[PDB]
Amino acid sequence: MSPILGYWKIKGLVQPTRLLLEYLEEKYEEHLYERDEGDKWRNKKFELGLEFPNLPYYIDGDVKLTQSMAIIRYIADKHNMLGGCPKERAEISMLEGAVLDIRYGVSRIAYSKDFETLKVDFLSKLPEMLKMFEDRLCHKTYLNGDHVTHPDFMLYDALDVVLYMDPMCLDAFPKLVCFKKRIEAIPQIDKYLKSSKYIAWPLQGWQATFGGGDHP
Amino acid sequence: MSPILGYWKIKGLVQPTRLLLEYLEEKYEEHLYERDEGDKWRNKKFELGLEFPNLPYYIDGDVKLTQSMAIIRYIADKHNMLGGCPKERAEISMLEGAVLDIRYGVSRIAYSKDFETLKVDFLSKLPEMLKMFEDRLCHKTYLNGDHVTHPDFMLYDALDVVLYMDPMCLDAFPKLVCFKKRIEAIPQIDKYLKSSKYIAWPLQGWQATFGGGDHP
Ligand SMILES: CCCCCCSC[C@H](NC(=O)CC[C@H]([NH3+])C(=O)O)C(=O)NCC(=O)O
Ligand SMILES: CCCCCCSC[C@H](NC(=O)CC[C@H]([NH3+])C(=O)O)C(=O)NCC(=O)O
Secondary structure: OOOEEEEEOOOOOOHHHHHHHHHHOOOOEEEEEOOOOHHHHHHHHOOOOOOOOOOOEEEOOOOEEEOHHHHHHHHHHOOOOOOOOHHHHHHHHHHHHHHHHHHHHHHOOOOOOOHHHHHHHHHHHHHHHHHHHHHHOOOOOEOOEOOOOHHHHHHHHHHHHHHHHOOOOOOOOHHHHHHHHHHHOOHHHHHHHOOOOOOOOOOOOOOOOOOOOOOO | OOOEEEEEOOOOOOHHHHHHHHHHOOOOEEEEEOOOOHHHHHHHHOOOOOOOOOOOEEEOOOOEEEOHHHHHHHHHHOOOOOOOOHHHHHHHHHHHHHHHHHHHHHHOOOOOOOHHHHHHHHHHHHHHHHHHHHHHOOOOOEOOEOOOOHHHHHHHHHHHHHHHHOOOOOOOOHHHHHHHHHHHOOHHHHHHHOOOOOOOOOOOOOOOOOOOOOOO
């Protein structure tokens, strides 16, 4: 019984988790809820044995989890990727949070009718946020050094998303540009992005003003 | 050189961390930025050796951290409180996320001019969120069982906050009511809440429409 990953058929909160599973070459099945299957989800929500019913959820022979960050960290933890000591684990958790400020920064304004105006303010703040990652990568192949960790896939997802908002937001950040290409150069990832399992759109929920809809 | 915890002189994102430090009886100093000291923060922001400059930050003889969740988890990790195995650590991370949905649910609408209207929608969703914790606590003293973990202080903070929004939101949840009292019954916590170090207000930043200002 291979693990089941449930979520809307969008990138959203679970995309980084998918990339991690693919990177690790872990077998898994997905239960994807289409745009008109909310009803299907509601009728199963409290019937899966989940303590805190939500999307995404992860069910396998050992656990039943919800909360996207708990799920991605569980998968990484099962592969001894969370960090070898408190200091290292904290570094990795700090990177997570830093990436979320960007990813969630996008989603918080993506559902507004005044997206364009909010976008201006967000994009004026994005540079400073990106620069901390740029500096972090000037002497490191990946966020935690020579080896890939789950925050790398989180950052990748965030970069993919902001590049849709503004294709030139990385022009002043060559290391981030190269980092994104480097992630796509990982064999498992390249294979995944080219497979039928890859969900390129939407970024947020279908109803979103930005990153929504059925097509880019 | 005891650890330094920097943050605005508000509860906000760091309150649970303060409670954890007090619970563990760890010595620490705080660098509190008053409402009119933003300028003071800006001039120090990139001068503290922080890789991802932000508030709160935690600096001690071993690390320099930012991102509230990385900080609270570091402190807990130093005391072997994050979980003994992947499954347990994931349970604890799931609880964190579940609490944040509530705490951040409040902050996302607390800065709006239309707070009252947004409040109505939030409070109609809060019950379902609280009920998952209520059920979790029907056969457990604390969120993870007989012993306290950092999510307990996170939940406490969230309950403290929503009780300000609606003093009756816990009427249908007796276990959560008792849980809040149980936390306040911990000697270190009772002592802290009664000390001069305790910051009762504001909940969000001073500019917030809800939980803001200099006085309740
Ligand atoms: C960040 C970019 C895009 C975000 C799209 C929204 S995610 C779907 C939504 N789930 C959540 O909001 C989960 C939040 C939770 N904190 C987590 O991280 O898992 C849902 O439908 N949950 C099911 C339910 O509420 O019943
Ligand atoms: C949740 C209830 C109340 C929230 C009040 C806002 S927190 C202060 C703000 N910091 C952040 O937003 C940090 C976000 C980061 N994700 C974290 O969790 O630490 C700041 O002034 N950072 C300093 C800066 O940006 O220079």
